[PDB]
Design an enzyme around this catalytic site. Structure first.
Site, PDB file in Angstrom:
ATOM      1  N   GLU A  46      24.524-135.060 -72.218  1.00  0.00           N
ATOM      2  CA  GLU A  46      25.410-134.505 -71.214  1.00  0.00           C
ATOM      3  C   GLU A  46      24.750-133.239 -70.672  1.00  0.00           C
ATOM      4  O   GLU A  46      24.372-132.358 -71.441  1.00  0.00           O
ATOM      5  CB  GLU A  46      26.783-134.154 -71.794  1.00  0.00           C
ATOM      6  CG  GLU A  46      27.850-134.015 -70.721  1.00  0.00           C
ATOM      7  CD  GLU A  46      29.234-133.593 -71.186  1.00  0.00           C
ATOM      8  OE1 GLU A  46      29.322-132.859 -72.193  1.00  0.00           O
ATOM      9  OE2 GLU A  46      30.217-133.995 -70.537  1.00  0.00           O
ATOM     10  N   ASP A  66      34.669-123.449 -68.664  1.00  0.00           N
ATOM     11  CA  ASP A  66      33.722-123.178 -69.728  1.00  0.00           C
ATOM     12  C   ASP A  66      34.076-121.892 -70.470  1.00  0.00           C
ATOM     13  O   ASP A  66      34.545-120.919 -69.877  1.00  0.00           O
ATOM     14  CB  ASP A  66      32.293-123.115 -69.188  1.00  0.00           C
ATOM     15  CG  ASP A  66      31.680-124.498 -69.055  1.00  0.00           C
ATOM     16  OD1 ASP A  66      31.422-125.120 -70.105  1.00  0.00           O
ATOM     17  OD2 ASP A  66      31.483-124.953 -67.912  1.00  0.00           O
ATOM     18  N   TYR A  91      36.218-139.008 -72.763  1.00  0.00           N
ATOM     19  CA  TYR A  91      35.936-137.724 -73.376  1.00  0.00           C
ATOM     20  C   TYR A  91      37.196-137.259 -74.093  1.00  0.00           C
ATOM     21  O   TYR A  91      38.128-136.806 -73.448  1.00  0.00           O
ATOM     22  CB  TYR A  91      35.526-136.730 -72.286  1.00  0.00           C
ATOM     23  CG  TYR A  91      34.848-135.476 -72.785  1.00  0.00           C
ATOM     24  CD1 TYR A  91      35.508-134.579 -73.617  1.00  0.00           C
ATOM     25  CD2 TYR A  91      33.532-135.204 -72.454  1.00  0.00           C
ATOM     26  CE1 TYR A  91      34.881-133.436 -74.085  1.00  0.00           C
ATOM     27  CE2 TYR A  91      32.891-134.064 -72.913  1.00  0.00           C
ATOM     28  CZ  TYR A  91      33.574-133.171 -73.725  1.00  0.00           C
ATOM     29  OH  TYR A  91      32.945-132.048 -74.185  1.00  0.00           O
TER      30      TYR A  91
END
Ligand code: 0JO
Ligand code: BR
Ligand code: CL
Ligand code: CL
Ligand code: CL
Ligand code: CL
Ligand code: CL
Ligand code: CS
Ligand code: CS
Ligand code: CS
EC number: 4.2.1.20
Lengths: 253, 394
Positions: free
Chosen positions: A49, A60, A175
């Site tokens: 990834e 993030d 995911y």
């Protein structure tokens, strides 16, 4: 291509979990990045990834924020990232390569054109971090037209409606971030689930596979290792290889 | 799935990570419920009146329009408790948080006005408040910072990225995703993901509702145009909302032109940016050719933001509202003119709106026109900034 399907079939045939590391492209610079990535592969990464540096990565945490800053400090642009991707694929024909993108970089010069470039360079999937399923239609459509798997996050606050949409809309893998989630995803014939929630130890990989997931994504631990070894290019690659080997060994049982 | 439309034409939406969608859906449902709840509306009205001081004055400015056929009124949001229009919608959002059973508040701020409004409301209503402001903003704005802390709020400097309002915005979204069970995110403008552009408009729309009643009382007709500065879009949409269906009334939004549009050092993405996806919305952005979010610029900290609320982008696209820009030097002249001729010290943000009204008048001094400028804040916070410029300039 069918890189993910071929991978999962090989792993199913070897009773094996996937281990997938994340790194930011061009962190801490282009050449070091290319060597980092080659080390991850050589050490047994099943897939990659790869993040493209973005000015405002709102999804993030601090580890990856600074990874982006290191990359920008080295002048890294999306165009340079796409050059790297072509070189990586030219070297490694079978490994699945997924991108972790922010929506503006996908939308910037046209959504179709973005996924066309992905297809050209040989990317396999795209996860757009700030596009929920509710907003995903043009991204999913463009991805599938260009033989790119659109990857969706199934979060820990997921409900049944969300589980059905993720199952229907995603490809490649799901995911993840419980038994309920995993079996329900399977019930709805979702893409194989990779656990991505704070994966940092070998045992977490073996716990994920035991839980019924198809393997595990280590979303920040690799970047931590880069971070801690910036003045030691040698140790960096050395600790990277030792980490990936241990994680990948954990996926065989 | 939502109860209300998240888009204004092409603009808007909910471009957040999946994990935040339940928080946005919860907020939308609570808002829709609250809007039908007479008890909520009464509590909100009580705070606006008896705590913040509404209705605000509508002041006729005779000296600055002398010798022209412009009549100019200022809607006096500078007189609201806290010194800016930001107080209106913080009170509503704080009540929504309580409705939801939340005990904590997260807020972003650039100038510090929204941060101070968030901290005052939190102090009044018993919420634990933390403010993201980001290193560059925190390093300056020590006045507004101390007020925030002097009201019990936690002020958190962000050093991530450029270390400014957008990163403040970023870290607020980052925090909320993990904390939304306990904390409400009190976004400070009519931007971000649905349902914020809608909520912030509805909790600011008394600006325009009062202005309409006041102009009717004083002049017996609607204004020819209402003029407001546009950062994220809250004061402007609060003035505009109640006039959208009055098609004769012009709606003029003023973005910061900074050092001049041609310099690229501005904050006018609506007219000089291009559509992108960031901060949870599809809207005009200032961005590099490659799609990195660009840094904006304005002498006024409150307008220094490289995007704009989606309802403004929409109203522009259909021709309902018109958007213009005013440079730092024009805003500074308007600031000085209002101080000297009307005895009102305006915020530098609001001075952009006034500057454009003065241009409307000066350019066509025999045009008959009835104008209202939204004076979104007082300019006490800007006195040191203006001092240092006039001293540097001579
Ligand atoms: C950005 C902030 N202030 C913005 C502001 C603005 C611009 O924000 P809106 O476009 O949302 O009104 C206008 N007038 C005043 C007095 C302001 O303080 C803030 O306090 O965080
Ligand atoms: Br420009
Ligand atoms: Cl390979
Ligand atoms: Cl992510
Ligand atoms: Cl009425
Ligand atoms: Cl008109
Ligand atoms: Cl018009
Ligand atoms: Cs599927
Ligand atoms: Cs006049
Ligand atoms: Cs702006």
């Amino acid at each position: 291509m069918e890189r993910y399907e071929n991978l999962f079939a090989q792993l199913n045939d070897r009773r094996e979990g996937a281990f997938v590391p994340f790194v930011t492209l061009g962190d801490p610079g282009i050449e070091q990045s290319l060597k980092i990535i080659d080390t991850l592969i050589d050490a047994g990464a099943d897939a990659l990834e790869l993040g493209v540096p973005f000015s405002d990565p709102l999804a993030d945490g601090p580890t990856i924020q600074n990874a982006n800053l290191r990359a920008f400090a080295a002048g890294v642009t999306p165009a340079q990232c796409f050059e790297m991707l072509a070189l990586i694929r030219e070297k490694h024909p079978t490994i699945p390569i997924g991108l972790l993108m922010y929506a503006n970089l996908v939308f910037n010069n046209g959504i179709d054109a973005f996924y066309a470039r992905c297809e050209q360079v040989g990317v396999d999937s795209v996860l757009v971090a700030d596009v929920p399923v509710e907003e995903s239609a043009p991204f999913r459509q463009a991805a599938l037209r260009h033989n790119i798997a659109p990857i969706f996050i199934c979060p820990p606050n997921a409900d049944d409606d969300l589980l059905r949409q993720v199952a229907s809309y995603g490809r490649g893998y799901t995911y993840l971030l419980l038994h309920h989630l995993i079996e329900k995803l399977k019930e709805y014939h979702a893409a194989p689930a990779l656990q991505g929630f704070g994966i940092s130890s070998p045992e977490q990989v073996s716990a994920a596979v035991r839980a019924g997931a198809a393997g595990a994504i280590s979303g920040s631990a690799i970047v931590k290792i880069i971070e801690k070894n910036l003045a030691s290019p040698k140790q960096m690659l050395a600790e990277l290889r030792s980490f990936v080997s241990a994680m990948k060994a954990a996926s065989r049982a | 799935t939502t109860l209300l439309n998240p888009y204004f034409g092409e603009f808007g939406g909910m471009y957040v990570p999946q994990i935040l969608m339940p928080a946005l859906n919860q907020l939308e449902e609570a808002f829709v419920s609250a809007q039908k709840d007479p008890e909520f509306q009464a509590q909100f009205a009580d705070l606006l009146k008896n705590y913040a001081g509404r209705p605000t004055a509508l002041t006729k400015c005779q000296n600055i329009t002398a010798g022209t056929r412009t009549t100019l009124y200022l809607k006096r949001e500078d007189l609201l408790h806290g010194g800016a229009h930001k107080t209106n919608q913080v009170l509503g959002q704080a009540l929504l948080a309580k409705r939801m059973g939340k005990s904590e508040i997260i807020a972003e701020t650039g100038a510090g006005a929204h941060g101070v409004a968030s901290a005052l409301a939190s102090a009044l209503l018993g919420l634990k408040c933390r403010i993201y402001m980001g290193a560059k903003d925190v390093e300056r704005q020590s006045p507004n910072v101390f007020r925030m802390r002097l009201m019990g709020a936690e002020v958190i400097p962000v050093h991530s990225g450029s270390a400014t309002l957008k990163d403040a915005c970023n870290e607020a979204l980052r925090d909320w995703s993990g904390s939304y069970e306990t904390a409400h995110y009190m976004l400070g403008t009519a931007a971000g993901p649905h349902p914020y552009p809608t909520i912030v408009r509805e909790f600011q729309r008394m600006i325009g509702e009062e202005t309409k009643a006041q102009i009717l009382d004083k002049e017996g007709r609607l204004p020819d145009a209402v003029i407001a500065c546009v950062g994220g879009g809250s004061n402007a949409i609060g003035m505009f909302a109640d006039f959208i269906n009055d098609t004769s009334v012009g709606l003029i939004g003023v973005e910061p032109g900074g050092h001049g549009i041609e310099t690229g050092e501005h904050g006018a993405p609506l007219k000089h940016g291009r559509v992108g996806i960031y901060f949870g919305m599809k809207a005009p952005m200032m961005q590099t050719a490659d799609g990195q979010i660009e840094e904006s610029y304005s002498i006024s900290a409150g307008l220094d933001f490289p995007s704009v609320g989606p309802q403004h982008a929409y109203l522009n696209s259909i021709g309902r509202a018109d958007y213009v820009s005013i440079t730092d030097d024009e805003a500074l002249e308007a600031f000085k003119t209002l101080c000297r001729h009307e005895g009102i010290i305006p915020a530098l943000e609001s001075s952009h709106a006034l500057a454009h009204a003065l241009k409307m008048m000066r350019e066509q001094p025999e045009k008959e026109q009835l104008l209202v400028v939204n004076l979104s804040g007082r300019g006490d916070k800007d006195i040191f900034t203006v001092h240092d410029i006039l001293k540097a300039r001579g």
